[PDB]
Amino acid sequence: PRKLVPLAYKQFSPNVPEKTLGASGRYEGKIARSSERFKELTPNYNPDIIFKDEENTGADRLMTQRCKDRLNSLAISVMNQWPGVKLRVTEGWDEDGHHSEESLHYEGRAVDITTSDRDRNKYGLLARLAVEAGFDWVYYESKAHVHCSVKSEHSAA
């Protein structure tokens, strides 16, 4: 086994920019409910994940299949890491323009996460678990959350 080293505040892994092919790849444009690409999004109702849903719209649950798969893997690892604690999503798909101009939040490929107990001291390790869970980019963006994203299925050729 390898020793698990938490990410430090503002560290990102892999250590390259988010929207490079070695990480989560390109911005593909905003997804709105009326978009054809809204069909890229699937609602995550994993009982072992808490969703903040501050907008009261269920947007936080709507994400791409790859995002869902990586998040679901991480959910198991979080419960393993801290028995009694669960993975929590505080911001998923954003319909409201609350990020920078070309955010993967706008297309359901990024989630901001915490632990269910909101113990900020756990977040560096949470970030390392997100890397181990296979998220394509993980960024300890604020003391209050870890930003995790995935690539799209649209660079296969």
Annotated binding site: 54-55, 60, 90-91, 94, 96, 105, 112, 147
Cα separation of 25 and 47, whole Å?
A: 29
List, in order, residues 6 or more apart from 116 with CB less than 8 Å away: 50, 85, 86, 87, 88
Q: Min. distance of Cβ 86 from Zn ion in angstroms?
A: 19
- Name which of residues 17 to 76 contact Zn ion (CB under 5 A): none
| Residue closer to Zn ion, measured from CB, 107 or 112 | 112
- Name which of residues 69 to 128 contact Zn ion (CB under 5 A): 112
Q: Min. distance of Cβ 1 from Zn ion in angstroms?
A: 30
Q: Min. distance of Cβ 141 from Zn ion in angstroms?
A: 6
Q: Residue positions in the annotated binding site for Ca(2+)?
A: 54-55, 60, 90-91, 94, 96
Cα separation of 87 and 129, whole Å?
A: 11
Q: Min. distance of Cβ 156 from Zn ion in angstroms?
A: 25
Strands (E), 41-136: 42-43, 49-51, 62-63, 87-91, 110-115
The amino acid at residue 128 is R
Binding-site size, Zn ion (CB under 5 A): 2
Neighbours of 130 (CB within 10 A): 29
- Name which of residues 117 to 156 contact Zn ion (CB under 5 A): 147
Indicate the SS3 state at residue 26: coil
Interface ranges with Zn ion (CB under 5 A)? 112, 147
